C-alpha cells in the first residue's frame, strides 16, 4: 500500500 508512505507520491 503506497498510500501509507508520507514521503512519496502514491499517484
Amino acid at each position: 500500500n503506497p498510500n501509507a508512505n508520507p514521503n512519496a507520491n502514491p499517484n
Partner: antibody
Framework: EVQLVESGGGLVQPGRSLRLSCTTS????????MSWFRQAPGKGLEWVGF??????????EYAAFVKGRFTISRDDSRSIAYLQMTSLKPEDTAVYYC????????????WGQGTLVTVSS | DILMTQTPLSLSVTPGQPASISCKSS???????????LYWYLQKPGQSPQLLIY???NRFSGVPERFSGSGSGTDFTLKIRRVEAEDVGVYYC?????????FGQGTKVEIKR
C-alpha cells in the same frame, strides 16, 4: 530549533465545525509531511491523518473514523498546517497533536503540545 | 487494519533492573523496499509523545543508550536495560507500513519501590 504549536481547541457543540492550526517555525515547512494525532482522555494514541509535501503531490490520508468529516490542509507560505473538523460528535473529544514527519525517520518525530477539543452540549 | 498487540500491559520495574516489552503485529511490517516500518514511542505523564526507536532498532538522536529494540516480521521487543524514574510513562509501538497507521494499546511502566 523545530517548533510546532497547536491552537484552536475549546468546547464546541455537537454537530458544529472547528478548525485547528499547527503553527511551525525552524525549518523549511514545505519540504515536510505533517501529521495529526489525537488522544481521548485516559486513552491511547490514535492517528488522524497526514498531508504530504507538495514535492510529492500534497495529498492527504485519513483514518476511517474521520473520512468525509475531516480535511487536512496546508499553507506553505505561512508555514501552517490545518485540521478542519465537521459534524463533530462527543466521541471526537480529545487532545489533538500535530507533528512533523521526518524523511530519514518517516514517522511523526517532533510533536506539539496538543490542543484540547471538548465536544459537548 | 493492522492490529498491534503489546504485552505486558503494565510493568513494575525495580530500579536498575531491565524491562522488556513485546509488540506483535497481525501482518508483517517488512516492506518490499527492505525496511521494517516499526517505531517505538514514550509518552511521559502529562507530556507529548516522544520517539525512542525507529525501524526496529535505530535509536533516535539523544535517546539514552539503555534503550534498544530488536525483532523482525511480526514480533518486536523494546528493552530498557536499567530503568530510571525518568523512564516512567506509557510506551507505544506504531506501524506505518499500512493505512491506517496504528498503535499498540500502550504499556504502562512504573518504578517498583
Amino acid at each position: 530549533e523545530v517548533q510546532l504549536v497547536e491552537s484552536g481547541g475549546g468546547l464546541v457543540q455537537p454537530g458544529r465545525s472547528l478548525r485547528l492550526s499547527c503553527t511551525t517555525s525552524g525549518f523549511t515547512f514545505g519540504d515536510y509531511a505533517m501529521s495529526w494525532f489525537r488522544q481521548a482522555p485516559g486513552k491511547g494514541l490514535e492517528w488522524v491523518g497526514f498531508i504530504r509535501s507538495k514535492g510529492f503531490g500534497g495529498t492527504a490520508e485519513y483514518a476511517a473514523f474521520v473520512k468525509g468529516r475531516f480535511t487536512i490542509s496546508r499553507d506553505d507560505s505561512r508555514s501552517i498546517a490545518y485540521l478542519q473538523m465537521t459534524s463533530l460528535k462527543p466521541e471526537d473529544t480529545a487532545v489533538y497533536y500535530c507533528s512533523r514527519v521526518g524523511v530519514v525517520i518517516a514517522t511523526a518525530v517532533y510533536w506539539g503540545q496538543g490542543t484540547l477539543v471538548t465536544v459537548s452540549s | 487494519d493492522i492490529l498491534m498487540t503489546q504485552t505486558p500491559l503494565s510493568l513494575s520495574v525495580t530500579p536498575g533492573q531491565p524491562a522488556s516489552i513485546s509488540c506483535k503485529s497481525s501482518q508483517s511490517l517488512l516492506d518490499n523496499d527492505g525496511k521494517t516500518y516499526l517505531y517505538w514511542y514514550l509518552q511521559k505523564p502529562g507530556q507529548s509523545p516522544q520517539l525512542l526507536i525507529y525501524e526496529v532498532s535505530n535509536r533516535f538522536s539523544g535517546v539514552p543508550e539503555r534503550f534498544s529494540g530488536s525483532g523482525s516480521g511480526t514480533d518486536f521487543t523494546l528493552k530498557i536495560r536499567r530503568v530510571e524514574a525518568e523512564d516512567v510513562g506509557v510506551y507505544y509501538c506504531m506501524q506505518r507500513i499500512d493505512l491506517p497507521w496504528t498503535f499498540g494499546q500502550g504499556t504502562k511502566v512504573e518504578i517498583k519501590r
